[PDB]
Structure 1
Amino acid sequence: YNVFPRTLKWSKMNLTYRIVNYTPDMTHSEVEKAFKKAFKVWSDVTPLNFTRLHDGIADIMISFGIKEHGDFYPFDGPSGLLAHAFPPGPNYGGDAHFDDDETWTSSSKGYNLFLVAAHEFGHSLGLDHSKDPGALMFPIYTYTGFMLPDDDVQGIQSLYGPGDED
């Protein structure tokens, strides 16, 4: 027999993601680089591995949308809600949605896609928000021009372990 796990977490270390569509705001290459770096934040401190799929169903489906986009969490135009992601699970579990009524960037202007995506993928992997104001998972955006804070390291390792500590 099997009882359920104690937390929402992926039961496998090899996870896939797919960039379903792209923002007008950045080139395809810049978006890809941002998401690759954002996953690396987490793979650098766990045994997780992330691979990109170009098509089909990936664990973590990433998309840009506005207003109603296929779930119970419609976006709200400029400002306000920026992005959301579902905890580990089937179907929409893991998926990350970005509000394209925001301006996404690879700079200090607008919202830096890398930084916001790194937070979103924390949710995709099983972290909720933190009360540590220095944490990546603290739900207030501050631009930094990157080292994963220790609160986030401790949280993600509580779920997956550290992987190679080197």
Structure 2
Amino acid sequence: NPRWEQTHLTYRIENYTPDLPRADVDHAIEKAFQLWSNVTPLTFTKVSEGQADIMISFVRGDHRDNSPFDGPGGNLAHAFQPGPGIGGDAHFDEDERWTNNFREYNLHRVAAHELGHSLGLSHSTDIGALMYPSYTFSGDVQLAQDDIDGIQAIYG
């Protein structure tokens, strides 16, 4: 279980799904980092060039890490645990239809989870928690107490 050693983190969106207008991608990701920074001392700065701590991208099938994606459904996205290089990165399967409504799959809602991982969280057994292994969604995204407790046990 690795932690980031600095509380000020960098992220960059390498590319944009065409499923959603650009501005909506930006706001889904932004608001998702916000869920995590609101309840910890972490801060996040977006950059448009060069390497960031958390590199975010949309990819399909084999994309040169060791977890190829699988077409629509199944695995939706994955993220790496804190650390250098791919450490921290999050990848979204472009074979999904990404949304900004209650319809599958809500980008902001998946991002909230993947970034949990990007910051060092593993899965929760609580079905109401953003970190539950499995996608759940009814149209609102909030950390559950379980999420707050786990991110605070890491960052204070």
Tell me the TM-score normalised to structure 1 length. 0.91
Q: Does 1:148 align with 2:143?
A: yes
1:12 to 6, 9, 22: 6
Partner of 1:56: 50
142-151 or 100-109, larger mean C-alpha shift: 142-151
1:107 to 101, 115, 127: 101
| Distance (Å, rounded) in 2 between the aligned partners of 1:109 and 1:144 | 8
**Deviation of residue 144 (structure 1)?**
2.9
Residues 91-112 of structure 1 deviation map (CA, whole Å, 9 limit, x = unaligned): 0000000000000010111200
Partner of 2:72: 78
| Distance (Å, rounded) in 2 between the aligned partners of 1:77 and 1:30 | 23
| Distance (Å, rounded) in 2 between the aligned partners of 1:141 and 1:72 | 22
- Structure with bigger gyration radius: 1
**Deviation of residue 132 (structure 1)?**
1.2
Q: Does 1:95 align with 2:89?
A: yes
Partner of 1:66: 60
| 1:32 alignment partner AA | D
142-151 or 114-123, larger mean C-alpha shift: 142-151
Residues 109-154 of structure 1 deviation map (CA, whole Å, 9 limit, x = unaligned): 1200000000000000000101111111001211132321000000
29-38 or 143-152, larger mean C-alpha shift: 143-152
| 1:158 alignment partner AA | A
Partner of 1:164: none
36-45 or 105-114, larger mean C-alpha shift: 105-114
1:137 to 114, 131, 134: 131
Structure 1 portions without partners, runs of 5+: 1-6, 162-166
| 1:113 alignment partner AA | L
Partner of 2:115: 121
Structure 2 portions without partners, runs of 5+: none
Q: Does 1:158 align with 2:143?
A: no
